[PDB]
Structure formats: C-alpha cells, structure tokens
Design a binder for these strands. Structure first.
Ligand SMILES: [Cl-]
Ligand SMILES: [Cl-]
Ligand SMILES: [Cl-]
Ligand SMILES: [K+]
Ligand SMILES: [Mg+2]
Ligand SMILES: [Mg+2]
Ligand SMILES: [Mg+2]
Ligand SMILES: [Mg+2]
Ligand SMILES: [Mg+2]
Ligand SMILES: [Mg+2]
Ligand SMILES: [Mg+2]
Ligand SMILES: [Mg+2]
Ligand SMILES: [Mg+2]
Ligand SMILES: [Mg+2]
Ligand SMILES: [Mg+2]
Ligand SMILES: [Mg+2]
Ligand SMILES: [Mg+2]
Ligand SMILES: [Mg+2]
Ligand SMILES: [Mg+2]
Ligand SMILES: [Mg+2]
Ligand SMILES: [Mg+2]
Ligand SMILES: [Mg+2]
Ligand code: NA
Ligand code: NA
Ligand code: NA
Ligand code: NA
Ligand code: NA
Ligand code: NA
Ligand code: NA
Ligand code: NA
Ligand code: NA
Ligand code: NA
Ligand code: NA
Ligand SMILES: [Sr+2]
Ligand SMILES: [Sr+2]
Ligand SMILES: [Sr+2]
Ligand SMILES: [Sr+2]
Ligand SMILES: [Sr+2]
Ligand SMILES: [Sr+2]
Ligand SMILES: [Sr+2]
Ligand SMILES: [Sr+2]
Ligand SMILES: [Sr+2]
Ligand SMILES: [Sr+2]
Lengths: 119, 46, 194, 237
RNA sequence: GCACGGAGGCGAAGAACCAUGGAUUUCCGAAUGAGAAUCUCUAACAAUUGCUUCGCGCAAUGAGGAACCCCGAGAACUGAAACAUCUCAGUAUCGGGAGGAACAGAAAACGCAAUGUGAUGUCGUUAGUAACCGCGAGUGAACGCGAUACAGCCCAAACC
RNA sequence: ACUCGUACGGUCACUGAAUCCUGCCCAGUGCAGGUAUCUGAACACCUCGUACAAGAGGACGAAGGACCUGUCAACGGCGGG
RNA sequence: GCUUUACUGCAGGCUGUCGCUGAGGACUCUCACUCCGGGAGGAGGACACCGAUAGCCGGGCA
C-alpha cells in the first residue's frame, strides 16, 4: 500500500500469473524477495512481480524504486500465496522475477506495456 | 462455638495425647507426660 | 550484490524519513491499541532479527512489547533522609527500557527463553521493542546447530540474570579494557560500584 | 505534621464516601435513535436520596421503565416525550435547537448525548437565551452565560423541590440526618481549634490563624486552606 | 527401635541386622476441576505459554534448598569529635532468577611505546601507589609481574 | 474519593441560637487583577573565540518581581505629642 | 515533637523551551492525539495530555 502507486485490474493480474507459470516451465524464474532483488541488481530480470499483502511492508518497499532505476518492469499481485503457487511454490512468495521468459516473451512484453500505460 | 469435622479430629487427638505414660514404660525404662494439658489452665491451638 | 535485507536495514537508519516514516505513523496507531505484549508472526525488522539469531522455524517466537517512556517512577521518602537521598524527580533506574521489555516478554512466555531484542520505535509516551524468544523444549530447536545451546539448564531465565545482549551491555561489559574494572566479571563481585 | 482532613478525604475511605449502595439512579436522558417516536407515562413519583428532591418513574412505549429528573409540575398519568419532535411542554426533553428562546430548562447536557450535567438541583433552572446554527446560549443558575452545542438535550421547566433551602435546619440533628445521605464528613471542627500538628491554623495560646488566610493557587495540598486564591474578602469596598 | 515391663510371637522354609533395587505411600501442601483453618462439592495440566493431528493430543513453567552466585530496589544509626558534600555503604533489608557451582571469556584489548604482550576468572604483588576529597575526615584502582588452570569456536551477509 | 452529585451544588475557612448592631485603616504582610517602561532562565538565533568544542558577549524575553489598582466578616492595627 | 521571612534541600503548582507533531508575529486546515456518542457521527486539534528541561513560588515535607 505505501509502495503501491497504482491498482492492477484483476484481469491483467490473471495474464501475468499465467505468463509466470509458463515462464517456470519454459524459461527461468526467481522465487523470493532476496533472489528477486539480486536479479534486478544484476540486471538479469525482465519482469518482477510483487505481492500486495506483505507484512511487514519493509520486506518489499524497495522493489519499486530499485526497479525504476534499472528499467526493469514490475507488477503487483493481490495475494501472496498465488504468486507463490504461480511461481511453482508450495508456500507463498512476497516477490518474484521472471529471469528471461520462454515462449511467453510476447506476453510478458505486452503486460509490461499495458502497465507502463497504466502509469 | 461450632466445630467442623477437622477441628473435631484435632480436638480428639489433643484429648488422646492428654493421657498418662503407661506404667509398664516406667518399669521398662526403670524410671512423666511433659505434654499433659488441663482444659482450664491451658489453651489449645486453632 | 546487495541483499534485500540491506534495504530493510538502510530504511531503519532513519525511521523518520521516506516510506518508513509513513509506515510508522500508520502502524503506531494500531500498536497503541494493542496490549503490553503482542505475539507476532513475523519480525518488523527482518534483517535485524536474522542478524540477532532469528530463524523461520518451529520454536522461534517474536513479540512486540511496549513500555512507558521517561525516567524512574519512584515514591518520595516517608522517613528521614539527608538531602542527597531525598531526590525523586531526576532519579533514573539502572536498567534501560529495552531490558524491562525483554523481561515482560519472557514473563508472558514462561516456557520460552529470550534470545535477543531490538527497537521498533516510540512515540512521545512509550517505546516498542520486538523480542525473539526460543522454545528450548521443541525438537526442531534441540536439533539446531545454531540455537541448541540455549537449551542448556544454565540458560533458564537467562534474561532475569542479565545474560542477554542488552543485559550485558547495560552491565558495562562491552569494553574488555579500560573502564571495565568494576563491571567484569559481574557487578556484584565488584561490590556494586560499576 | 500530620495530613489535614482535606487530605484524608482523597483516600476515599468509608468515612468520606457517599452511600451509593443506597442511591437509586443517575437520571440521565434516554438515548433515542431519532424520529422522537419515544414517549412514556409517569407511573409514580419517588424521593431521590442523593438529591433530597423528587424524581418521576416513567414507563416508555418500548417497555423501558426508568427514573427521570423531574421538573416541577409533573404528576402520575401525565405523558412525557423525548426526541427532536417532542412537544414543547414541561417535562419533555429535546435538543436545545428545538427549544424556543426564553424557555426555562433543566438537566442540560454539556456535550450532546452525555445525559445531562447542568441545572439538576432542587428548584433550579437554566435559561435558554440565544439560538443559532452553531451555538445555543444558556444562562446557568449561577448567572453564567454558557455557550453550548445546539445539539445538547434538555428538559423543559424548572427542577422540582424548589424552596428547599428556605427553611432552616433549626437543629444539629436535622443536619445530621441529611449529612448521612451524602459523601461528607460532618460535623466540622475549626482549623484554629486544632493542634499545630493537625492544621496550618492550629496552635497558639488563644485561637487565631497565625497567618493571612488568603492562600495562593499554587499552594500544595496540606497548605491550601482558608480562603483559596480569593480575588477579595470581606463585605466592604 | 529409643525402653532394663508383662504376655505372646517370629527365626535352620536361615529371622534380626546391613547394602542395592523394587512395592505400598491417607489429607493439606507450588497444589493445578470448584471451594475450604488439613475438609467438602460436581470429571478436570487451574493459570500462562510452545508445538499442534487445533483435541490439554504432546510438552514447558510454578515451589523448595545452609550458604555460596547473577540481575534489580536500596536505608539509618555511625565517622567527620556539630553538620549539609563526603562517611557508615552499594553495607542491612526488599523484589526477581540459575547452578552444583555461578558470573566472565577469544580484543573495535593492552600502551613496562615496543623489533613488545596476546580470551576469562582467581591467588600473591603492583599499593594505600595513580586517582578522588568541606583537597577535611576519609575513599581507592589498573597495566604489568609471579602463580593456578589453560581452549578455542559458532552465526549474520556476500556466492548458492 | 467527592459523584447514581451539578451552583437551592460541594469544596475551603472564620464566627457561633434569637434580638439590637458590627465604626476607621490597604502603609507593611497575604491574596487577586493590571501593567507603557524596567528587571527576568533555558533551547533556538547572532558576534567573538576554537580548523571543532570548552568559553565570553549579544539580541529576544514567559511566569515572577519592580510599579499601579482592588480587598479587613484577610493577617492584623486603631498610639505619643 | 512543634514553629518560622534560621541554614540547606525535596515534593507540588505556575510559566517558557524541546520531543510527541502533521498540511497550507498574526492565520487557516486535518491526519496524529484528546473528549462526547451504543453507532453513524460530533467537538476539539497540532493545542491539550504525557516524557525532558529551565525560571518563579514553595515549613506541604525532610
Ligand atoms: Cl529468558
Ligand atoms: Cl447542607
Ligand atoms: Cl605487555
Ligand atoms: K548521614
Ligand atoms: Mg478420658
Ligand atoms: Mg553452518
Ligand atoms: Mg442522573
Ligand atoms: Mg456518614
Ligand atoms: Mg465548627
Ligand atoms: Mg486544644
Ligand atoms: Mg503545620
Ligand atoms: Mg478567635
Ligand atoms: Mg472564639
Ligand atoms: Mg485441590
Ligand atoms: Mg558527627
Ligand atoms: Mg566471581
Ligand atoms: Mg571539620
Ligand atoms: Mg568507596
Ligand atoms: Mg591499565
Ligand atoms: Mg466556643
Ligand atoms: Mg471516556
Ligand atoms: Mg522541620
Ligand atoms: Na482453656
Ligand atoms: Na520465559
Ligand atoms: Na515411602
Ligand atoms: Na503441567
Ligand atoms: Na490443547
Ligand atoms: Na562526633
Ligand atoms: Na548532633
Ligand atoms: Na567530598
Ligand atoms: Na618486567
Ligand atoms: Na495594608
Ligand atoms: Na518530643
Ligand atoms: Sr506463508
Ligand atoms: Sr482463665
Ligand atoms: Sr523459572
Ligand atoms: Sr452522569
Ligand atoms: Sr452515561
Ligand atoms: Sr494558631
Ligand atoms: Sr466595611
Ligand atoms: Sr592460554
Ligand atoms: Sr448572634
Ligand atoms: Sr495590601
């Protein structure tokens, strides 16, 4: 909420998670706020997801700005356990990063575009 | 007063202790109950 | 590269600036409505907790404790005292508030042992600290190479005997040389002059 | 010395407490959702131990039986109303806003919904003077002009039992009986009549305070006795 | 049994007695189903916690102990020939807590200043020295050295 | 606590039924109000000083005091010539 | 033990300042905080309460 500056439509969120699910089966994806954070820093990240029900919020407050000053696109998910499920985890995940998609590149691209438009 | 069952048990014991040292103990030890109490001269507890 | 943790750390170096400022302004409103000791599922300052020994595991508990701000809450002398021992207002206690917080927490969880604690802010009338407590009776912990030490009998009620990190600092045990002549090995053994 | 009587009071021991277990009720206005569709009928008049004044038991439509702070002139059978649309008659309660200027009221709330704080004693009454959309001006029994939220509720009329003060107690025994119904230690031993250890005015061959009686507002308890922060004393000038 | 009586009994089916282990072990008592001056009333980890199969299912705490020990609270008589800083003294006493011993402990040390020492207690000494102090009365270390005993390691993060 | 109380209350004091009455004094002390000007601490601020700091000085100035007023059924006073 | 314009201090009250504490020498606002209300909501409001400190009074107390 303090780090969220725009609302993502339930639909867009749908496509992204699906794209993320195919990304783990095809390309490469990072699971966890630490790994997600390094990807953005190492630049090896194309799309980073960030749950919105993270408490305490400090765990993710940094993602947004760190991503901006790295051109890396990011998107918010409402639930924490969905991102974890979609990431292929048996647990939740505060953040995630698609480290080079796979047969989803087209989709990931659009999502990033759709977001920038959503300001 | 009104005595409870427990109070009564305690009073009963005090009554029992308040007895003479058997005569045979006298012989056996070849020669006094130091805890002899009187209802009037003394005061029990509780 | 920088860990995600360093970002939590760096945020807390200035709890009065940035997003953290807004978080605290929001949070404290709720904290003020909470009790004296509230157990919480996750540390507010993750980097700090892990740094102090915290682990996401069975037998590890975190609780936020609040304590009234200010100096001593002492009652004026009812019997004769020389001017020196008549003070009441500016007299402060010898234990810092964090230590009082660690003890209250440990009282709430009689079976747990204090591992460490850290500050999470304050307002004008109280201070909050989160305390990490460990269950010395849980096998997940009895089998931990990093925490099983706290299961030893002589570690029971460690907070009440000043064996915490906050305890040791407050007893003037930081320095190994000059200035610790009356603190080490204990305040009591040195006649209580430290 | 020893703590003075005024200090013993504060500990709230039996000697200084009011006989609350013997008191009836706290005549606070009824709480109405709105509409004013709340009316009841005076079922009986009773004596209020805590105020030496009469009180009226009212049975409301919705089945609530409660004692009420009765104004003068309320009798059994009479029907009272409490709400914004309540009729403007003695014994009825409604927000000052609805009350017509120049009308005597009692049991006036300080803050809307508190239940009534002002003008509750025998035969007293506040005088609603000015109206407005922001503030209702009432003149309290002490003569003070009070600015209140027009949303503050009040009862029309003056409090029952007026004139109670016009008759002298005549004897100590009568004072005694009344004092036994209040939270007060009585009779009263003069400070000048006590030992120095017991009061600022105690001690001395003959009785007299060995000091000026007008004490400062800043004086600590134990010393604040006599004429507290008096703006003046006497009858002259 | 103490205990030197009377009567009676047990023991070669090896008693008594002693060691080790086991059985029994009323009620109150931390006292824990609720209550109560040691009893009573109608199935009990009461209360606080952890785990949790979310069910008291599995566990913890509570109270005791001669002093010793650790963490807090902390006088006054007394000395100064009065007395207020100072002293008595961090003593008496109080609150909390552990153990068989506690506590301390592997340097953001020392500073015989060095091309030197090398975790920590403790003992002897350094020394009534340095330092404090109505610079009064009084208070009072440390480094080092000689000994005792010796022991050094584990996390957080980086990268996974 | 007062207080299931709200100035026709209850707190703090003095005098001590009724009756006839209760004079003069506000300088001191007390209380209270006011106050152009004077005085009036710390933080912040300015100058000097210090590569910094100690420190010195300045400006601003709250209550309080100076000063003015009210007040004796307030402490008390009501003499000598 | 008691008294006071004895000495020295200590509570307590008043007052300034700093923190709580926010937005646009006089001002508006609302979002902390406070109060009223069963609730909605209302009142107040960066003040007050509280922590710290400074000056004044201070036989109430040692
Ligand atoms: Cl502990
Ligand atoms: Cl009366
Ligand atoms: Cl050396
Ligand atoms: K002394
Ligand atoms: Mg017999
Ligand atoms: Mg390891
Ligand atoms: Mg009432
Ligand atoms: Mg009475
Ligand atoms: Mg009298
Ligand atoms: Mg007398
Ligand atoms: Mg006195
Ligand atoms: Mg007289
Ligand atoms: Mg007289
Ligand atoms: Mg029982
Ligand atoms: Mg002497
Ligand atoms: Mg030792
Ligand atoms: Mg001398
Ligand atoms: Mg000494
Ligand atoms: Mg040294
Ligand atoms: Mg008389
Ligand atoms: Mg309230
Ligand atoms: Mg004295
Ligand atoms: Na007897
Ligand atoms: Na504990
Ligand atoms: Na046995
Ligand atoms: Na148990
Ligand atoms: Na259970
Ligand atoms: Na002497
Ligand atoms: Na003397
Ligand atoms: Na001295
Ligand atoms: Na040498
Ligand atoms: Na005068
Ligand atoms: Na005496
Ligand atoms: Sr989870
Ligand atoms: Sr007798
Ligand atoms: Sr224990
Ligand atoms: Sr009321
Ligand atoms: Sr009420
Ligand atoms: Sr007198
Ligand atoms: Sr006159
Ligand atoms: Sr060694
Ligand atoms: Sr008369
Ligand atoms: Sr005067």
């Amino acid at each position: 909420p303090v780090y969220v500056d725009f609302d993502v439509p339930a639909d867009l969120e749908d496509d992204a998670l699906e794209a993320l699910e195919v990304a783990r089966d095809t390309g490469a994806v990072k699971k966890g706020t630490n790994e997600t954070t390094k990807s953005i820093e190492r630049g090896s990240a194309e799309l980073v997801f960030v749950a919105e029900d993270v408490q305490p919020e400090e765990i993710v407050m940094h993602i947004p700005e760190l991503a901006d000053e790295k051109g890396v696109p990011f998107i918010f998910v409402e639930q924490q356990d969905d991102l974890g499920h979609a990431a292929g985890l048996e647990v939740g995940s505060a953040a995630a990063a698609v480290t080079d998609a796979g047969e989803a590149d087209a989709d990931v691209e659009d999502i990033a575009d759709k977001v920038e438009e959503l300001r | 007063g009104k005595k409870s069952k427990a109070t009564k048990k305690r009073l009963a014991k005090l009554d029992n202790q308040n007895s003479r040292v058997p005569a045979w103990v006298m012989l056996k030890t070849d020669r006094r109950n130091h805890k002899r109490r009187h209802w009037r001269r003394n005061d029990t507890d509780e | 590269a920088r860990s995600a943790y360093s970002y939590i750390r760096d945020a807390w170096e200035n709890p009065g600036d940035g997003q953290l400022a807004e978080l605290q302004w929001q949070r404290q409103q709720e904290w003020r409505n909470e009790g004296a000791v509230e157990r919480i599922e996750r540390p507010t300052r993750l980097d700090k907790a892990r740094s102090q020994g915290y682990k996401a595991k069975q037998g590890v508990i975190v609780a936020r404790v609040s304590v009234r701000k200010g100096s001593a809450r002492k009652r004026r002398h009812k019997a004769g005292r020389r001017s020196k021992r008549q003070g009441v207002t500016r007299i402060t206690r010898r234990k810092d508030i964090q230590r009082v917080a660690e003890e209250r927490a440990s009282r709430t969880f009689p079976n747990l042992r204090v591992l460490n604690s850290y500050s999470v802010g304050q307002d004008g009338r109280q201070k909050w600290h989160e305390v990490i407590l460990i269950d010395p009776n849980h096998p997940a912990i009895q089998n931990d190479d990093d925490l099983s030490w706290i299961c030893a009998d002589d570690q029971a009620d460690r907070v009440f005997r000043g064996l915490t990190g906050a305890g040791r600092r407050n007893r003037g045990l930081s320095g190994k040389g000059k200035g610790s002549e009356k603190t080490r090995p204990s305040l009591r053994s040195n006649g209580g002059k430290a | 010395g020893r703590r003075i009587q005024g200090q013993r009071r504060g500990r709230g021991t039996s000697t200084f407490r009011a006989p609350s277990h013997r008191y009836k009720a706290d005549l606070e206005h009824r709480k109405v959702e709105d509409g004013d569709v709340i009316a009841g009928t005076v079922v009986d008049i009773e004596h209020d131990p805590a105020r030496s004044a009469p009180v009226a038991a009212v049975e409301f439509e919705d089945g609530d039986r409660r004692l009420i702070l009765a104004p003068e002139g309320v009798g059994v059978g009479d029907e009272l109303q409490v709400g914004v649309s309540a009729e403007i008659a003695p014994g009825n309660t409604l927000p000052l806003a609805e009350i017509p200027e120049g009308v005597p009221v009692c049991n006036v709330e300080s803050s809307p919904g508190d239940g009534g704080k002002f003008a509750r004693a025998s035969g007293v009454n506040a005088q609603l003077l000015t109206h407005d959309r922001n503030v209702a001006v009432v003149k309290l029994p002490s003569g003070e002009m009070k600015r209140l939220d027009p949303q503050c509720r009040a009862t029309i009329g003056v409090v029952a039992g007026g004139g109670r003060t016009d008759k002298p107690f005549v004897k100590a025994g009568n004072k005694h009986h009344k004092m036994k119904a209040r939270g007060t230690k009585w009779p009263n031993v003069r400070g000048v009549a006590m030992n120095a250890v017991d009061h600022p005015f105690g001690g001395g061959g003959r009785q007299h305070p060995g000091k000026p009686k007008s004490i400062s507002r800043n004086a600590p308890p134990g010393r604040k006795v006599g004429d507290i922060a008096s703006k003046r004393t006497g009858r002259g000038g």
